[PDB]
Design a protein around this ligand. Structure first.
Ligand code: HNU
Ligand code: CL
Length: 130
């Protein structure tokens, strides 16, 4: 219905605002664009499901997220991809891991403070109806 379309539109406006707040934080610059194969040709061979915040915006705009849980799965991928590709004890890998954990924690903290649980439950029930 039109009222369900309006619910998904509100979801996309909420997700674009959360994503923009993460993307303008200087700690998370490395996560704003896909990894360039020039710099990192083994990336695409190790990480099978690359994800970054520009890809998340594109997904929102293609109507790929119908719940905040689905969006958070892609934020969790940005985090777990960085834990898997950069697992060493050296400071460059530790800094990327701590920035990726902090992205994930920040997205979950904004959602805890600003997502109404009844709005998420509504989205979940429309999704499940389809
Ligand atoms: C799992 C997310 C966070 N990762 C971290 O805590 C990183 C260190 C990496 C480690 N030893 O795991 N932060 C630092 C350097 O303090
Ligand atoms: Cl830096």
């Amino acid at each position: 219905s039109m009222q369900e379309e309006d619910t998904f539109r509100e979801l996309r406006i909420f997700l674009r605002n959360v994503t923009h707040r993460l993307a303008i934080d200087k700690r998370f610059r490395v996560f704003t664009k896909p990894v360039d194969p020039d710099e990192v040709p083994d990336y695409v061979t190790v990480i099978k499901q690359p994800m970054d915040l520009s890809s998340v915006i594109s997904k929102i705009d293609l109507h790929k997220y119908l719940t905040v849980k689905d969006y958070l799965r892609d934020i969790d991928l940005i985090c777990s991809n960085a834990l898997e590709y950069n697992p060493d004890r050296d400071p460059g890998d530790r800094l990327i891991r701590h920035r990726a954990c902090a992205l994930r924690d920040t997205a979950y903290a904004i959602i805890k403070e600003e997502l109404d649980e009844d709005f998420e439950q509504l989205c979940e029930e429309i999704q499940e109806s389809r």
